[PDB]
Amino acid sequence: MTDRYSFSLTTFSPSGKLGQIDYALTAVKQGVTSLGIKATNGVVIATEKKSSSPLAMSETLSKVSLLTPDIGAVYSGMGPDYRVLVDKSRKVAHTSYKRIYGEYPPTKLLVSEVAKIMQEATQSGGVRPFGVSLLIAGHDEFNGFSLYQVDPSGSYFPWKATAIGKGSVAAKTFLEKRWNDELELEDAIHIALLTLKESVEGEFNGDTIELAIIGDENPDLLGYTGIPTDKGPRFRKLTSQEINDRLEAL
């Protein structure tokens, strides 16, 4: 019953810092590495499944999420914050876009809405900022493939390739060295695997690594036939087996 903190919990300090946003960014730093690489014909987003218990079934906890048939997200930072942001991102894609124009939002606009939701946790009364950074990759007819980072402050930036979390500095270095504008999706997936092995402590296989792509349309995932102009999602989560296949010729 009723809130006593109807004031901003994020305020400016004498030096100009927004304390709570910095502290949230530190929470992202402690988080498991995730990364994204943009190709000519796709985007790859990848991350490690740091399991809490070997008694836990790690397939019941996805770090890589579909947001629209052509947009997926990954994060580094606080898992539960990510989980609720995914729900709101899914919802806002419908309420602010699909229920208006009868189609899914382009990547930049959806990222824009998520950014807005995060900005509000930075200005509103009685809340702390979200403790996560998201990488959001997608496709849309008029913009093609794209990749965005969203930070706890609500800031977003487009990337050719980036990494967030623990070893992000070493991984960005590793990516700047390897990225070019002629990469096919398979090349990007390969680079994503190499980059991620540096980060991973333990086993490095299709059960401990989580990987998804925004590629071409998967008509076999649509669920129905008969409408030619409907071709299926571009978001595709790679299977454990599909990952192990690419680790043999790694």
Binding site: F7, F12, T122, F157, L175
Partner: protein, 235 residues
């Protein structure tokens, strides 16, 4: 919101202090156009220059803003400014005069200063616009909700340094092309980087529309910036 014993607003002053660490944005007004130029905050090789707009935004067909501060705060305000321009267009069947839009935005910022216990927006704007009453105009607004009109101005880092340079070289009879040169030279002199390369800039003009009698906002593609940087002899 509260006053200090000095008669100052703490949170506003601290917001202003935040802005002085953001990339410099420069606005220059000439008789036949306006220039907006801004320095992108320390970037990386892998940033997508092509699909990036962090400092320059279109408000309507005749008005644009350069941003210094938190981008997410600025998008909040930009969005309401866009709505405000459309409400005016719907009400009067005329494009909104620049000052009216600027005053509104400034009033929103002022509100956060005076009631509600929320933090102010950490944003300073340079507005560049044209209308049939005052022709070309340049305004500035900061977190306090104050706004002033200028012939040339800067916000963000090194405003003091950039302001002195503009004061020296500015002349009332300038054409846009001379103003393009002035803004780039000033950013070059005041950068905290080695060189002022294309990948670290956003650039835009509001001109008399190539050849027409109408008004055109040109937001420079990265390649265009590279050219206009050679022309002015900074390469």
């Amino acid at each position: 919101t509260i006053f200090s014993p000095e008669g100052r607003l703490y949170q506003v002053e601290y917001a202003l202090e935040s802005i002085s660490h953001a990339g410099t944005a420069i606005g220059i007004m000439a008789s036949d156009g306006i220039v907006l130029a801004a320095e992108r905050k320390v970037t990386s090789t892998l940033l997508e220059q092509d699909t990036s707009t962090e400092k320059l935004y279109k408000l309507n067909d005749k008005i644009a803003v350069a941003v210094a501060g938190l981008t997410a705060d600025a998008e909040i305000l930009i969005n309401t400014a866009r709505i405000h321009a459309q409400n005016y267009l719907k009400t009067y069947n005329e494009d909104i005069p620049v000052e009216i839009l600027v005053r509104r935005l400034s009033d929103i910022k002022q509100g956060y200063t005076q009631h509600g216990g929320l933090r102010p927006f950490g944003v300073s704007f340079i507005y560049a616009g044209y209308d049939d009453r005052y022709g070309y105009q340049l305004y500035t607004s900061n977190p306090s909700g104050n706004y002033t009109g200028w012939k040339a101005i800067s916000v963000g880092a090194n405003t003091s340094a950039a302001q002195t340079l503009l004061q020296m070289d500015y002349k009332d009879d300038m054409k846009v092309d001379d103003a393009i040169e002035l803004a780039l030279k000033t950013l070059s002199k005041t950068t905290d980087s080695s060189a002022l390369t294309y990948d670290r800039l956003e650039f835009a003009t509001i001109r008399k529309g190539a050849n027409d009698g109408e008004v055109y906002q040109k937001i420079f593609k990265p390649q265009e910036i590279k050219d206009i940087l050679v022309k002015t002899g900074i390469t």
